[PDB]
A paper describes a structure:
BSEP dysfunction, caused by mutations or induced by drugs, is frequently associated with severe cholestatic liver disease. BSEP has two transmembrane domains (TMDs), each composed of six TM helices, and two nucleotide-binding domains (NBDs). The NBDs of BSEP are predicted to form one functional nucleotide-binding site (NBS2, consisting of Walker-A and Walker-B motifs of NBD2 and the signature motif of NBD1), and one degenerate nucleotide-binding site (NBS1, consisting of Walker-A and Walker-B motifs of NBD1 and the signature motif of NBD2).
No ATPase activity was observed for BSEPE1244Q in detergent or in proteoliposomes, even at elevated concentrations of ATP and TC. To capture BSEP in a nucleotide-bound state, nanodisc-reconstituted BSEPE1244Q in the presence of TC and ATP was prepared for cryo-EM studies. Approximately 60% of the particles adopted a closed state and yielded a cryo-EM density map at a resolution of 3.0 Å. We observed tightly packed TMDs and NBDs in a closed conformation. We observed two distinct EM densities in the two NBSs, each corresponding to an ATP molecule, which is consistent with the characteristic architecture of other ABC transporters. We also observed clear densities for bound Mg2+ ions in the two NBSs, which are coordinated by the beta and gamma phosphates of ATP, the glutamine residues of the Q-loop (Q503 and Q1161), the serine residues of the Walker-A motifs (S462 and S1120), the aspartate residues of the Walker-B motifs (D583 and D1243), and water molecules. BSEPE1244Q represents a state prior to ATP hydrolysis, whereas vanadate-trapped BSEP represents a state immediately after ATP hydrolysis.
Numbering used by the authors: 45 to 100, 128 to 346, 353 to 637, 739 to 781, 790 to 1010, 1013 to 1317
Amino acid sequence: VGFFQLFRFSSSTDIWLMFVGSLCAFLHGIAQPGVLLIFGTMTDVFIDYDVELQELRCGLLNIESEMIKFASYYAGIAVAVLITGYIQICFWVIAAARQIQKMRKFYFRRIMRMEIGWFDCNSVGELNTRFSDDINKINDAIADQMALFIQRMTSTICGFLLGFFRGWKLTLVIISVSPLIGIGAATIGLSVSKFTDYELKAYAKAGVVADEVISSMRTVAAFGGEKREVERYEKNLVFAQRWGIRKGIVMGFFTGFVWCLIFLCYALAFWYGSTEYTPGTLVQIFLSVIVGALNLGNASPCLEAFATGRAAATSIFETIDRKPIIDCMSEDGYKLDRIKGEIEFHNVTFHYPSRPEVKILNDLNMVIKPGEMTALVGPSGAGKSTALQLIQRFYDPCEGMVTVDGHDIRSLNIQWLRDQIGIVEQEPVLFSTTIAENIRYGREDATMEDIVQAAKEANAYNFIMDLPQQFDTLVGEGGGQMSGGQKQRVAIARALIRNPKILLLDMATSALDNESEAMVQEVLSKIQHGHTIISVAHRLSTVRAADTIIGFEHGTAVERAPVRRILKFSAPEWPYMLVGSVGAAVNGTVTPLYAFLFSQILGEQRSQINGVCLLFVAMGCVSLFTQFLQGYAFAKSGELLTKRLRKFGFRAMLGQDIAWFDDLRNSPGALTTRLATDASQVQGAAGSQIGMIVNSFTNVTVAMIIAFSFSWKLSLVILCFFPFLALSGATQTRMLTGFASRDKQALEMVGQITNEALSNIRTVAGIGKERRFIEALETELEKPFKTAIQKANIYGFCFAFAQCIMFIANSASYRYGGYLISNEHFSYVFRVISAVVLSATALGRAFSYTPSYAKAKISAARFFQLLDRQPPISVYNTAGEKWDNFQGKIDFVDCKFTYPSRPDSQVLNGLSVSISPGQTLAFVGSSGCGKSTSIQLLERFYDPDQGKVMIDGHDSKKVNVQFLRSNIGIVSQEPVLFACSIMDNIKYGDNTKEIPMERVIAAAKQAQLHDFVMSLPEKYETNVGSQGSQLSRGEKQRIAIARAIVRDPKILLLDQATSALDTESEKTVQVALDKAREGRTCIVIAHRLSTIQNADIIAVMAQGVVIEKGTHEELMAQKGAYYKLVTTG
Ligand SMILES: Nc1ncnc2c1ncn2[C@@H]1O[C@H](COP(=O)(O)OP(=O)(O)OP(=O)(O)O)[C@@H](O)[C@H]1O
Ligand SMILES: Nc1ncnc2c1ncn2[C@@H]1O[C@H](COP(=O)(O)OP(=O)(O)OP(=O)(O)O)[C@@H](O)[C@H]1O
Ligand SMILES: [Mg+2]
Ligand SMILES: [Mg+2]
């Protein structure tokens, strides 16, 4: 993008701030040539004073009056430089902050406004990484590097034109060589922009990997994939590291080339242009050479910033200006009144944008009557959810048209249309907030009476009146801190609160027991009179009350100490730090050495020109290598340090226990932005900042050494001032840390909000609350704005104070030197001491690196607190009992457990069941009785408070976690997947070693998956999408079963393994699962009692304790709770 398109979000006030700050930066830049002029005048008057002393009109001119005059001039320029520096830094920072805030708001608005298929083709980790890092880089490009670049540019141009205005026919060569510098700068800018593009692509890939791995923590722990994920992260880390070192190399070459050219150019100029000049003119010429070279060399980080900003803004602008095909927030359309509910299909044909080669809907024709219940039935993959989504205008038909009461869906207002549809998805998804808030997302004006009535109708009221925080308990993120049936009932309430006209049910009772199913069916039967209900069913029991049934057959419808820690951590990069330190030490020493040698050389017949030219060429020659060395070494050290930080952080994050991830302050959004941003913040201080610091320190040290080498009374007076500089630096660091302390909480919260919004676009679109999430993001973003406007003042004032106290020190030195001259050859001593102290004037800019220092401090502190934690269940711990012959005998003895997130609610009350090896147990009961909790305890995701579980006579709390986990096969209530092929998803079962193709094929065959995957254009290579969301839920359950089976585990865990695949007209998957459970210990929990018919032992669990136990015949004969559960349906 164009460099001046980065300001496309500016308003009039922003333009005013930029103009005023730029004027102040121009004055600050021209401050230094005034210093050159006064030094030249002082030299002239010094020689004019000592000529008459050499002699002995004359006697009329003294020294003290002019010395006080010079001191007053240095006081005036110091006041001016303080004012101008403060204004420039402050104003540029405000302008940048306002622009960045506006662009972030616009980016999120445009992303939310997009259509569903675009989200199918784009990963949420990509967008999160962009929103976190690329806009930050854009901000870094235009914040204050812009002002510093302007100041250095005006200082260099004025140092050049000093020779033109004062002096003549000596600056003929800078005009000759400037275009070469221009082309060099342009080419290096293009190169580093390309390298930046590659670097951000690599970091975006790494961000996607981290997001998926962190959001799939239970699965990645169950199947032991930590090593695979750390390697997967490290690959992208290595790629980005290579691009970063290339950037450092090219930049270091640019800086060294600039220095060497400049010095070589002026050496040749002094060689030939000599063929009149007072010594003061020579003095100011030599020092103008240095000011030009130094500021030109120091401008390079600004060029880095601008090119990185353009490269980063490319993709952000491309996303921001895209026009979506289907706009959920557009006004255009029609809003009819008095809808009846008749919806028809007309020869509809559809293919997903992700798989365009598959015809999923093929010439469909169905009619849905008003005020009736119509049930859709068919096998898995028959395109029922596709029609369900096409009704909502999630997509558009390729051919054909679906009408609502005789009107094309495309011709109606999308907001009004979607505000009349009540949807329950196959897997209800809740947002991390209270229960009443989650239910109220259906209708914002819903009162507490409305919420409680919706909960009562949804058969959810009792289980939330049995909670400690009734209606105010946090459901957790994604509703994870909830049971499946409870989550489903909350979703039913959220759907029914709106009182919709088109009520839509996608397996509305999948995770419900028969009693709650009966209650919900009674409510639906009461409601059925008015609204038109469309529900997909797999069982005839719910079909009993449906008026018409439509069958789907493959797309056709037929009716009926952080600093010390960092220093120790960065030990491996010691040689690069050593070489960079040596190079920057030489670079610091060369300047005062030049001042001394030049001042010596001046005080013109023989060999003086040869000496001058030889010195110039030697300095250019040395400076090229040393500047290159400094830049390259420090860039390499920073890159390696950040790579190691990211790798170790991801490893430590993966090594934590499941209760740590259940913390409400440990969300994947927060952890992802933490991992993405802490390393970058540390980089911003561990890069070339250290090289600049050591360069400046070596400069000041050498300058003071050779100042004290001549007269100690003036050098002491000069050294008297530096405590003020140290105090200013410390104060800035203190306030910066104070602000960053809460800046990081604000950043984590905005990251959590944006990830929760992006990851569940389908749910947010279904309920239609697009505005609420954008408003919440803006509200959470408004918090750091005040902090930013407050830190701008601190930064500007500290920078200005340092630069001002330097000139104060110079004026005081002039006054005291005048006193020493008048009171007590001292003119020569003062000349050389002033020369070196002026050559040592620009080293005090140690406040450019300070604003990043506090960020690095806080980030490193938090990183080490995360790194040094000891989990209660350490999966990286190699200590624990192991026995060679495993048998899979499991028994609970008086197991009790309470969730750490809900300490006032005990879930398990003395669980005690036993299983002999080779037997299966069926856990039956109501929803939320702790059935999945026992499985979590078995998988050592948690540990019982009192009581214990024994595996083959070994207490579970002393057996190795990896060893135990290798012997278990688990399927979850809501299985999850990774965004890769079906093949790799199956291969994930055994992560220790590769498994042959034959085993995968066999597992797929026994999982009833081979035919469907054979039907795909890519057989076993098709991408499944993020979380495996680009498949119907039946095939997700089937791939989960295949992945569990492929391990051949001694313990097999089945949690509602037939929830989605429920077509019971054929006895095939039942035989498949029976053969799977053959010959091994299995625990199978299922709310449908026909599939657990043949279990050896059936345990009925109520309120965390087992109340019945036996086989099917004894439990049936006892007429207990099992008889009522069976006979109720
Ligand atoms: N986003 C997507 N990208 C590609 N293919 C998809 C996507 N969503 C669904 N499909 C495919 O569409 C077909 C039917 O999906 P759909 O979810 O409508 O089936 P279904 O009859 O509702 O199944 P189930 O009974 O398992 O819920 C399947 O082949 C599935 O893989
Ligand atoms: N991570 C969690 N943190 C806190 N409470 C939880 C958590 N997971 C579940 N619960 C609660 O513990 C109780 C039992 O949960 P569990 O998931 O074990 O039930 P379940 O018997 O398997 O139910 P269902 O048949 O609905 O799946 C419920 O009240 C549920 O809301
Ligand atoms: Mg479905
Ligand atoms: Mg469960």
